[PDB]
Amino acid sequence: SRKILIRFSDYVEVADAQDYDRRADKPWTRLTAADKAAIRKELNEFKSTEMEVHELSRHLTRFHRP
Amino acid sequence: SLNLDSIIGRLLEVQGSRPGKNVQLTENEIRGLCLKSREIFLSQPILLELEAPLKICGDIHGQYYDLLRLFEYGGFPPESNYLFLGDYVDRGKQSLETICLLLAYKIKYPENFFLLRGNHECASINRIYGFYDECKRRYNIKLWKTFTDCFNCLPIAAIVDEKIFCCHGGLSPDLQSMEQIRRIMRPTDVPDQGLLCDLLWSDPDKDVQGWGENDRGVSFTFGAEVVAKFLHKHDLDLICRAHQVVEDGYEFFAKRQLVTLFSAPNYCGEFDNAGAMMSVDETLMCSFQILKPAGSGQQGKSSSTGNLLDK
Ligand SMILES: [Mn+2]
Ligand SMILES: [Mn+2]
């Protein structure tokens, strides 16, 4: 069997997290169909014309169906 | 001039203020952080080879005051060395302060401070999950585009002491050799499928044999036997990943062959989880330090997806 180097400690440390209101806006729940279409178009144009991508990675650029 | 020490001091000084206080950086200060960090990322490998001692942290999601508390506990750089696993921005109140402090520390301590790419460090995701809107409110869309160029150059995975494989998401059916990671060229986007997608998006699932469908609608799930075979093939001991909220801030899978880390306590004020970091000492002993808070109408998921823009 294979020799394992890693070990885990059973003794965990805990500290009290900050008490504050962490709630944040959810803009992705406020998109009409037309808004989504506009964002797909915006992203596609940005990625095609402005966003630098290495030649060997242009096949990875993620386009959205308009 | 980068004005780096002034930037760091201003980012840190709000630790004694009420939670949520913004830090007033200039547009050109933030641009400089993006451009200089990007240069450093490109100068280092896309598959980082790191050595302990190190503290490893999972998702932060703009919870800047929790990031400050995490650094207070672990030691502010350069007192400890850090590796973060991605998901710095989106789905929180202060993505800008969060990413600016992380980039400033990367520039200041480039051999002692490391950042991997999460699935939120890409344009299609952070366009909609909050970061674009935060940039627009405080600065402009051009600044968001500058951040995108920086994010497109983040490294994707790390191996610690030849034994801990780290990435945001998880394994891929397309990952047969580490050379496949090393061959990925930056800047790059994150695709909707393939190796780079899976490294940033996949999840473990105890009830999957092999590779399965992912509830997110992107990438895959993978089972415990996939983990075991991967570790055996590559002579590794642990996969360390992030990307899922877990109650204690850390959670094991596959008889401790994988761990999930999540560093944002009380995630977005809707979940009752702790945030954790994993410390790896020079003997390869791993330990945990946690910051713990005090029908169809069921609570929503905490996970993100890649298909929210679909027509
Ligand atoms: Mn996340
Ligand atoms: Mn994620």
Residue numbers in the entry:
A (entry chain C): 515 to 580
B (entry chain A): 6 to 299, 320 to 336
Provide passages from the article that reported this PDB entry.
The three Protein Phosphatase 1 (PP1) isoforms regulate diverse cellular processes, acting in partnership with over 200 different PP1-interacting proteins (PIPs). The four Phosphatase and actin regulator (Phactr) proteins are novel PIPs that are implicated in cytoskeletal regulation in animal models and cell culture settings. Here, we show that Phactr1 confers sequence-specificity on the Phactr1/PP1 holoenzyme. We show that efficient catalysis requires interactions between conserved hydrophobic residues in the substrate and a novel Phactr1-PP1 composite surface, which comprises a hydrophobic pocket and associated amphipathic cavity with a surrounding basic rim.
Fusion proteins comprising PP1(7–304) joined via a (SG)9 linker to unphosphorylated substrate sequences were coexpressed with Phactr1(516-580) for structural analysis. This approach allowed determination of the structures of the IRSp53(449-465) and spectrin αII (1025–1039) complexes at 1.09 Å and 1.30 Å resolution, respectively (referred to hereafter as the IRSp53 and spectrin complexes), but was unsuccessful with Tbc1d15, Plekho2, afadin, and cofilin. Each asymmetric unit contains two complexes (RMSD 0.22 Å and 0.17 Å over 288 Cα, respectively), in which substrate-Phactr1/PP1 interactions are mostly conserved, albeit with some minor differences. The substrate sequences, whose N-termini are largely unresolved, make extensive contacts across the PP1 catalytic site, then extend in a sinuous trajectory across the composite Phactr1/PP1 surface, making numerous hydrophobic and ionic contacts. In IRSp53 complex 2, K452IRSp53 (−3 relative to the phosphorylation site) makes a salt bridge with PP1 D220 carboxyl, in the acidic groove, while water-bridged hydrogen bonds link the mainchain carbonyl and the sidechain hydroxyl of S453IRSp53/S1029spectrin(−2) to PP1 Y272 and the phosphate, and to V250, respectively. The dephosphorylated S455IRSp53/S1031spectrin(0) hydroxyl interacts with PP1 R96, H125 and the phosphate, its mainchain amide and carbonyl contacting the phosphate and PP1 R221, respectively. The phosphate is inverted compared with the holoenzyme complex, losing its contact with PP1 R96 and H125, but making contact with the S455IRSp53/S1031spectrin hydroxyl. The structures of our Phactr1/PP1-IRSp53/spectrin complexes are consistent with their representing the resulting enzyme-product complexes, stablised through the tethering of the substrate sequences to the holoenzyme. In both structures, the residues +3 to +6 form a β-turn, allowing the hydrophobic doublet L459-L460IRSp53/L1035-L1036spectrin (+4/+5) to make intimate contact with the Phactr1/PP1 hydrophobic pocket, entirely burying the +5 leucine sidechain. Pairwise combination of substitutions at positions +4 through +6 suppressed reactivity even more, with the LL459/460AA mutant being essentially unreactive.
